[PDB]
Amino acid sequence: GEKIKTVSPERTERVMDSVMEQRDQIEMMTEALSDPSLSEGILDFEDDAAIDEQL
Amino acid sequence: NWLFGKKRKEDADALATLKGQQNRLQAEARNLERQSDEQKILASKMLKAGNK
């Protein structure tokens, strides 16, 4: 009973909710930094036609 | 050179986003007007039926 009062179930719910929220924020931050639109940058105006013919 | 087309594309995409959002807002306004007309007619009907 002393242990259950110390680490209550509501406390575990709060901890797991915080873990979920922080995991979501890390995923969003680390996928924002990996957007291929930068290294791609300028895209074909012909929309891959030149690269199609090159392939 | 190619940057001009990119700028035009960005402006067109921004206008498309703004117009789409305005389309949602006009749809919601239309729904609200529909509900308000229905409610006015219903109120007149039940006042015909005797309740205040």
Q: Obtained via which technique?
A: cryo-EM
DSSP output for B18-45: HHHHHHHHHHHHHHHHHHHHHHHHHHHH
Query: Using alpha carbons only, what angle is made at residue B12 by residues B7 and B18, rounded to the nearest 5 degrees?
Result: 130
**Dihedral sign computed on CA atoms, order A25, A31, A33, A37:** negative
Which residues make Cβ contacts (< 8 Å) with residue B2, sequence separation at least 6? A42, A45
User: Which residues of B fall within a CB distance of 8 Å from A43?
Assistant: 6
User: Which residues of A fall within a CB distance of 8 Å from B3?
Assistant: 42
- Measured in angstroms, the resolution is 2.9
- How far is A12 from A45, CA to CA, in rounded Å? 53
- How far is A23 from A17, CA to CA, in rounded Å? 10
State the alpha helices, DSSP H only, in A1-54: 2-6, 9-32, 37-40, 49-54
Q: B18 CA to chain A: closest CA distance, Å?
A: 22
- How far is A44 from A50, CA to CA, in rounded Å? 8
